[PDB]
Amino acid sequence: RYTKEDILKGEIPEHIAIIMDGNGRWAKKRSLPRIAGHHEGMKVVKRTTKLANELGVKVLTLYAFSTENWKRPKMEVDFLMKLPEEFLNTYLPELVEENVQVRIIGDETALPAHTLRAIEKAVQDTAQNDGMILNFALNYGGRTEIVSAAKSLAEKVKEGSLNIEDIDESLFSTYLMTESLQDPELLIRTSGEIRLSNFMLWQVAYSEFVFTDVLWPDFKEDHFLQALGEFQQRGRRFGGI
Amino acid sequence: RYTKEDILKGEIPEHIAIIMDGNGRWAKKRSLPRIAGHHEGMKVVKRTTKLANELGVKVLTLYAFSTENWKRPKMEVDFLMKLPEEFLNTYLPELVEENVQVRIIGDETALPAHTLRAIEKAVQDTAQNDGMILNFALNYGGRTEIVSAAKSLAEKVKEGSLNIEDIDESLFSTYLMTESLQDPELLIRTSGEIRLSNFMLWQVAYSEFVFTDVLWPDFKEDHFLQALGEFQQRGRRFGGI
Structure with a gap:
């Protein structure tokens, strides 16, 4: 019901954080293998980034889950560990051209050296951009x-x-780890669970939370816009704090 | 739709926490003064406690907001500060008979000595009960x-x-402050806001959250039961973690 021009009329949160849940559930729904779900979730990162940048968002934090929810086979673990490099190989030139700054938080010692070296290069190659910050939370826990x-x-x-x-x-x-970032004004969690799951406990003390049943690989522009519309409607509520 | 016997068939969270919001909004809806809303919210504490105790809940944490949401006149501030004593004067003998243990967390230095002395007496008078813990969070902040x-x-x-x-x-x-307590498995927030508001940031890392538009003075047995029913339904979801 909310158009993009409808949304641009109102307040745009400066820092949005998204818990990117539902990749596996999406693959199962589509009769696709789990790694196809992971690959697709990686692709929806680019579309979401583009829209947030176009709307004037200043920081987009994207949280990916680690292997700790459910033990997975070596093939799948290795596949997930290589996804940051594929994302950067495919999308970094666009990110550079869009004036995006790539940053990361979490336990970097959990990634292999080859992947760390590529991530660090992308961070350095975009650090003199001054546009939207795309902040990945990988192997990250609030506690x-x-x-x-x-x-x-x-x-x-x-x-x-x-x-x-x-x-x-x-x-x-x-x-x-968020020291150079303002706290998120809006947290979005996809895939239907109504939980924080150990994500930015300190920083989300006052954030608005928007929960959607949409699975992360299905979270297209119209769902992102509806979450912003809900955020905006809350600021218009009467009746006192 | 969920009966009390329906709920007793399933899992009862051992520690439930409730953010008691909406007292002021309720008074306004009812054309009653704000202090009538506060007094009524104090009364709904007793009914909720009784039901949780009867359902086998082991810890009920109740959070009351401080004056920091919106500055209030001295008359109202003083009224709120005397409410813990009125609650204990009215309800402590029942709490004793129901084997409840009264506890408190938060900044006790924010209350006047006379009120602290009464609260401490109630804690001491119920500390050799071994039933449900009724844990009040007063002048409490997660950060x-x-x-x-x-x-x-x-x-x-x-x-x-x-x-x-x-x-x-x-x-x-x-x-x-929660060191002797297990983390809440269920957090309930009344009055329609979808926010944590600086409540138990560390402890709710993995809790289920249930948000209801019902105002705290309207949160009767049937709404409490519906929140538990929702908690229980989530544990039955298929499709993986």
Whole structure:
């Protein structure tokens, strides 16, 4: 019901985060192998990025799940681990031309060196763009990020360069992986589950959440627009805070 | 559509948390003053507690909002600050007889001494009950709880009784206000907003969320049962994790 021009009339969240769920469920629905679902979810990243950039979004964070939901065979694990390189090989020149900055958060030590080297090159090749930030959360967990922040703070306290009385909320945010990013105003979760699943626990304290049953490989422009329309409608509610 | 006997056939979450929103909106709908809405929300705490206890819930956490959403006049602030004492005066003997344990989390220094003394007496008078825990979150914030945990860990590291390499997720949970409680399996938020509002960010990493438009003073047994029915239906979904 919401057109793209309808959406552009209202407030565009500066930072949108999406939990990209449902790739496997989509493959099963389509009688396709699981790796076809993963490959397609990789392709929908490009279309979503383009639309968010065109709408003036400033940061798009995309979260991919790790292997921890359900153990998978080596063939599939290796396939997932090579997908970041295929994405960059296929789409990085367009990203460069669209003035996108590619960034990543999460445990980079979980990826193999060859893949890290390609990701780092893409980050460096786009770091002097000044347009939309495309922020991938890979092998990322909210609780371990919080613990890591606490441990780095404790190391500075141990070494004597930080006083405990100077640790407050604002300082703590600077020790998270998201330190150079404003908190997301909108979180979208596809595939029907109504859970956070250990994603940006600290940063989403005040975000609007929009849950959709649409599977991530089916999340086209019209569904993205409907999520924004819902975000916008909430800001218009009367009756007090 | 879900009866109480229907619900008792399925899984009962051991720890349910409710964000008690909509008291003010309810008063306005009913042409009643705001303090009547607060008083009524206080009364619905008793009915909800009784039902959760009867269903075998092990921990019911109830979150009340502070004054920070919108500045309020002194008369109303003072009224809210006296509500814990009225609740205990009216309902503590029943709570004792129902084998409930009363507990509280949040910044207790925000309440006046007379109110703290009554709350502490109720906690002590019910601490040798071994039934359902009724856990009130008052003047409570998820981010400040996380910061406080990090600061206590850093103090032990500073004093030399904690090594940073021993700080992990399990240890961090023991430094939160919820340390003696399992994480909630179900979070319910009334009054229609789809947000966490800085409530138990760490602890709800994997919880099911159920959002309802029902205002907290209208949240009767049948709505509580429908939320449980929805929780139960999610555990029955096919198609993989």
